[PDB]
Amino acid sequence: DGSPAATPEIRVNHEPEPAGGATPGATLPKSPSQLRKGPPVPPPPKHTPSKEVKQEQILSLFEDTFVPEISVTTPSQPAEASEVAGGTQPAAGAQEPGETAASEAASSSLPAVVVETFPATVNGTVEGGSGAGRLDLPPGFMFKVQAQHDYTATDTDELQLKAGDVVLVIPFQNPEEQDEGWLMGVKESDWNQHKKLEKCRGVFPENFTERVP
């Protein structure tokens, strides 16, 4: 008959908000031993003495022969006999024979023996390498030495040696930088790097090495 109407409404809205952060950590660096050194190696008093003595001598020879040995002989002796008798005397007895004999012999030989000997040689192994050494020698250098033991040296300027290695004795940058019983030398291989030997310099125990004349 008479009645209005209506229709209400509604709504809703929103928006979240994220975030973030950081997660720091920590470190614990250490310091390595630079320019490390060790105690010297004192050599023995006596090991084994030696020497060398050579000599010689000359001699002569000689010989000779002469004056032969000859000699002949010719024996001889006749004979004879006779009789007379005067009848009234019969015979019976008679002479007696004799006859002899003899013998001989001989022998000999002559062996032999052979003996030979054949030599033999061979050479020609090297074939490659592929490398190149220095051109000029290191200044101040003294002489070459030879290791007698294998001492692993791991430092910021150490010199590794192997039982039977070659090292050249060179004058370090200073004696104060040298250790007691150790000197500044360079390996033969380093020699090839003479171009930068100053960067190949190292130290090594002389007592643990031997000098090469």
UniProtKB/Swiss-Prot annotation:
Signal peptide: none annotated. Heterodimer with AMPH. Binds SH3GLB1. Interacts (via SH3 domain) with DNM1. Interacts with SYNJ1. Interacts (via SH3 domain) with DNM2. Isoform IIA interacts with CLTC. Isoform IIB does not interact with CLTC. Isoform IIC1 does not interact with CLTC. Isoform IIC2 does not interact with CLTC. Interacts with AP2A2. Interacts with AP2B1. Interacts with MYC (via N-terminal transactivation domain); the interaction requires the integrity of the conserved MYC box regions 1 and 2. Interacts with BIN2. Interacts with SNX4. Interacts (via BAR domain) with BACE1. Binds (via BAR domain) F-actin. Ubiquitous. Highest expression in the brain and muscle. Expressed in oligodendrocytes. Isoform IIA is expressed only in the brain, where it is detected in the gray matter, but not in the white matter. Isoform BIN1 is widely expressed with highest expression in skeletal muscle. Is a key player in the control of plasma membrane curvature, membrane shaping and membrane remodeling. Required in muscle cells for the formation of T-tubules, tubular invaginations of the plasma membrane that function in depolarization-contraction coupling. Is a negative regulator of endocytosis. Is also involved in the regulation of intracellular vesicles sorting, modulation of BACE1 trafficking and the control of amyloid-beta production. In neuronal circuits, endocytosis regulation may influence the internalization of PHF-tau aggregates. The modification Phosphoserine is found at S3, S31. This is Myc box-dependent-interacting protein 1. The chain holds residues 301 to 593 of 593 of the full protein. Residues 1-54 are annotated as: Disordered. Residues 140-213 form the SH3 domain. Phosphorylated by protein kinase C. It is linked to Myopathy, centronuclear, 2: A congenital muscle disorder characterized by progressive muscular weakness and wasting involving mainly limb girdle, trunk, and neck muscles. It may also affect distal muscles. Weakness may be present during childhood or adolescence or may not become evident until the third decade of life. Ptosis is a frequent clinical feature. BIN1 mutations have been found in families segregating autosomal dominant centronuclear myopathy. Patients show adult-onset, mildly progressive muscle weakness affecting selected proximal muscles and all distal muscles of the lower limbs. The lineage of its organism: Eukaryota, Metazoa, Chordata, Craniata, Vertebrata. The modification Phosphothreonine is found at T7, T23.
